[PDB]
From Swiss-Prot:
Record-given protein name: Polycomb protein EED
N6-methyllysine carried by residues: K118, K189, K205
Entry PTM: Methylated. Binding to histone H1 'Lys-26' promotes mono-, di-, and trimethylation of internal lysines.
Modified residues (N6,N6,N6-trimethyllysine): K118, K189, K205
Function: Polycomb group (PcG) protein. Component of the PRC2/EED-EZH2 complex, which methylates 'Lys-9' and 'Lys-27' of histone H3, leading to transcriptional repression of the affected target gene. Also recognizes 'Lys-26' trimethylated histone H1 with the effect of inhibiting PRC2 complex methyltransferase activity on nucleosomal histone H3 'Lys-27', whereas H3 'Lys-27' recognition has the opposite effect, enabling the propagation of this repressive mark. The PRC2/EED-EZH2 complex may also serve as a recruiting platform for DNA methyltransferases, thereby linking two epigenetic repression systems.
Record text about domains: The WD repeat domain mediates recognition of trimethylated histone peptides at the consensus sequence Ala-Arg-Lys-Ser. This is achieved through an aromatic cage encircling the methyllysine, and involving Phe-18, Tyr-69 and Tyr-286.
Gene Ontology molecular functions: chromatin binding; enzyme activator activity; identical protein binding; methylated histone binding; transcription corepressor binding
N6,N6-dimethyllysine modification, residue list: K118, K189, K205
Ranges where the record places region Interaction with EZH2: 2-361
Amino acid sequence: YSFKCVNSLKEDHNQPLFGVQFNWHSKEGDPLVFATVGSNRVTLYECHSQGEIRLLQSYVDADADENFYTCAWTYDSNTSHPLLAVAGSRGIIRIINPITMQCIKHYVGHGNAINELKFHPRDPNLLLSVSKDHALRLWNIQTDTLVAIFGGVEGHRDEVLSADYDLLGEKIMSCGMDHSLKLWRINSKRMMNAIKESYDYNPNKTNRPFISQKIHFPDFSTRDIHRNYVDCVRWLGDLILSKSCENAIVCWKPGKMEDDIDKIKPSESNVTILGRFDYSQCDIWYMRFSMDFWQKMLALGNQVGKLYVWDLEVEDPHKAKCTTLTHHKCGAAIRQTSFSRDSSILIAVCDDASIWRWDRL
Ligand SMILES: Cc1cc(-c2cnc(NCc3c(F)ccc4c3CCO4)n3cc(C#N)nc23)n(C)n1
Ligand code: NA
Ligand code: NA
């Protein structure tokens, strides 16, 4: 069963769609749902049979000058109800109730735009934001606390564009405009204690403010993978996938070939390149690749509407199998893609506000 294009639509604001995410927490027996973000809007859609994309409801920011760049799903840890976090150029994180599209609460702190949001893979309350102000921030949305800020002179020296947690949420890799990729361990004694204290914090029961950690030294750093802005990074096991605007996703690891990622010291000067997935016409800034839930597949769109999909179910990264998907009516730049949890549907969103649905048939 290969992917076939079954439907498309266009949002009425005619501005770029910069983010799309399926809700991988959608419940058994419920339709698949994805969110899109662009302009000052967040919109939810349901996937139905015969390729139908059913429009539900939007959240529209009161600031006409807001531009949402990113969204991420989680759930309420006490009720299991789904939640959607969104953020963009205003640097405000909004937690949206996707049922009613009400803004439930918001967080301010970043000195500028937020370029990506990610939830911890094991803890639905821990939200990571990366910002134009050169820092990452880790929030606890259960107690509304800023747990840690990752920055300083040895942190990123320009806008941070992307970050990703590893499998267990023990470490973060970040990347951005300074061409660098940086590792931040969050399973240190200091960070585990900070997370524990954030859960114990209730401003109604104490006089102290909550103290955020300032983490000023990454556990690894390299500028030897890309030669331009690094705008997307993801873990693949202990390996890293990252891209710039140089028509390539590089698969690499810190240290030499046989170096364990958890033995890597901050002074480590070597990296190892395990493969590189080349493609065409994707040389503009701000284009994201995505993986499915099981990390069997990788997808990326290019600036003229072509989709590349790599099968990662092979013995080594450089053996990945590529397929391409095109439609004669899809010619705008694809900023982000999202697989449904089972990988039966792939959605792409574009600079002309169009949405493209591909079904595995
Ligand atoms: C034509 C155009 C493009 C953008 C734009 C998009 N996305 C971001 N950040 C989000 C992001 C990212 F960090 C890395 C990869 C990526 C995404 C969205 C799609 O893949 N942007 C940050 C600034 C600034 N300053 N501009 C943008 N605009 C406003 N207009
Ligand atoms: Na249509
Ligand atoms: Na108090």
